[PDB]
């Protein structure tokens, strides 16, 4: 998406701005654009709440340091922002929820660093332990803002090959070229409005297929900043 030799821009949304480079190479999940839920009897006697106030802006998650041995990271949506800003209290005080996303991933490194990060989105990202029966904890199943680290990235902590994750809206980050990705994600469920707390419609993964390498003496940790922007986010109160 975004890489060297692209006119630097300054995208502003609400009370927030990010200096990101304009690169018309954005990933649009399953060839769809985030829209406003089709008429469903539930929001016919209870119109959907669409806070454009401090909910439609640019949320920046605490950067993550990338070292030679980092195994990967992941975030659950909407869980990640459930605890963040009005996007939290709004998604909580309102039973039902529905929203799409502009997901931006970005590295900062020298032209003497090297590494390859795969960035994909996976609907219904259920995980499994090492086992006897035992469903994963609540702290790793719904990590929130901080996210969680992958333990066995080869099977994606879900008994399924990483080698095949590109069958999903992915985006590569090859320091040697670009240094940032962008993904448009449309709401995906088996019902128009689900529960903003119980269910996580999808998971975001940032895995380093090609480890980070440099010659000692150069910054040993590469930052990986992730900015999130809700698109057409509605909420049903039912009152």
């Amino acid at each position: 998406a975004c890489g060297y030799s692209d006119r630097v821009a300054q995208l502003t949304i609400g009370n927030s701005t990010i200096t990101t480079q304009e690169a018309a190479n954005i990933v649009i999940a399953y060839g769809e654009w985030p829209e406003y839920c089709p008429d469903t009897d539930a929001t016919a006697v209870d119109k959907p709440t669409r806070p454009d106030v401090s909910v439609n802006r640019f949320f920046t998650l605490d950067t993550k340091s990338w070292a030679k041995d980092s195994k990967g990271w992941y975030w659950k949506f909407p869980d990640v922002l459930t605890e963040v800003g009005v996007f939290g209290q709004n998604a909580q005080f309102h039973y039902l929820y529905r929203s799409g996303f502009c997901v931006h991933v970005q590295c900062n490194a020298s032209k003497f660093h090297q590494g390859a990060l795969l960035v994909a989105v996976l609907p219904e990202y259920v995980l499994g332990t090492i086992a006897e029966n035992s469903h994963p904890p609540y702290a790793t199943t719904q990590p929130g803002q901080v996210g969680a680290v992958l333990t066995h990235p080869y099977v994606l902590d879900a008994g399924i090959p990483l080698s095949q994750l590109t069958v999903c809206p992915h985006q590569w980050i090859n320091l040697r070229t670009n240094n940032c990705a962008t993904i448009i994600v449309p709401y995906m469920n088996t019902v128009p409005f689900d529960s903003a707390l119980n269910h996580c419609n999808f998971g975001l993964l940032v895995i380093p297929v090609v480890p980070l390498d440099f010659n000692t003496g150069a910054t040993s940790e590469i930052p990986i900043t992730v900015t999130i922007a809700p698109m057409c986010a509605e909420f049903a109160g039912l009152r």
Partner: protein, 228 residues
């Protein structure tokens, strides 16, 4: 081996690969046995929850997708444990989701009109029926990254497909030992969201847990990157 002979110079029909034909064909999903008396048959009835994650072969095929909608067709092959057929009258009752299941060989559960039952003699050719898309949601889903309220993590109850109550008709018990094979065939298939294929032995019906002590490599190994 690798006999590099006989080259196919004609493209094949795209119909083959179509999800419809991929997920077609009837298949054995369950085998119930009601012998006269031994361990679990001093009863004379069986309650089988329509379970698809029964045979990993079928399951791994589905797991290829996140959400799936479809109609099913069921056929009942019945004969004694040794292949013999006798003039025994059978009753298969379909217990719809959120409906009372038989608990006794004669629970009133067997008389309830809303639980559709099918009658057929053992000599009669196999009984066949089509059970719709019972899900309350727009489609079944093999994965639910959430909670339905943790031990109940990933469990989606919007998938419950119903139960089949088998048993022999008659006040008395049946003098014969039975063993019926249940075949299921998906009709009208539609899939959304294709996900990575399984590459670790399955360890549970309800989740995707894998033996983390023994993680297997998707592709065989070789000596050198050049030995071919």
């Amino acid at each position: 081996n690798l006999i590099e002979t006989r080259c196919v110079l004609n493209h094949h029909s795209t119909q083959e690969t179509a999800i419809g034909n991929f997920f077609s064909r009837a298949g054995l999903v369950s085998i119930i046995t009601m012998p006269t008396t031994g361990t679990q048959n001093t009863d004379g009835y069986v309650n089988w929850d329509i379970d698809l994650m029964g045979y990993a072969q079928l399951r791994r095929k589905c797991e290829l997708f996140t959400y799936m909608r479809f109609d099913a067709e069921f056929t009942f092959v019945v004969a004694k444990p040794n292949g013999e057929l006798v003039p025994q009258l059978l009753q298969y009752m379909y217990v719809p989701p959120g409906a009372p299941k038989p608990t006794s060989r004669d629970s009133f559960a067997w008389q309830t009109a809303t639980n559709p039952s099918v009658f057929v003699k053992m000599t009669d050719p196999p009984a066949q029926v089509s059970v719709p898309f019972m899900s309350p949601a727009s489609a079944y889903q093999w994965f639910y990254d959430g909670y339905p309220t943790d031990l109940d993590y990933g469990q989606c109850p919007n998938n419950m497909m119903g139960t089949f109550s088998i048993r022999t008709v008659g006040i008395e018990k049946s003098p014969h030992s039975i063993t019926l094979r249940v075949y299921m065939r998906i009709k009208h298939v539609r899939a959304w969201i294709p996900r990575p294929l399984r590459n670790q032995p399955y360890l549970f019906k309800t989740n995707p847990n894998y033996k983390g002590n023994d993680i297997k490599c998707t592709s065989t190994s070789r000596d050198k990157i050049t030995t071919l």
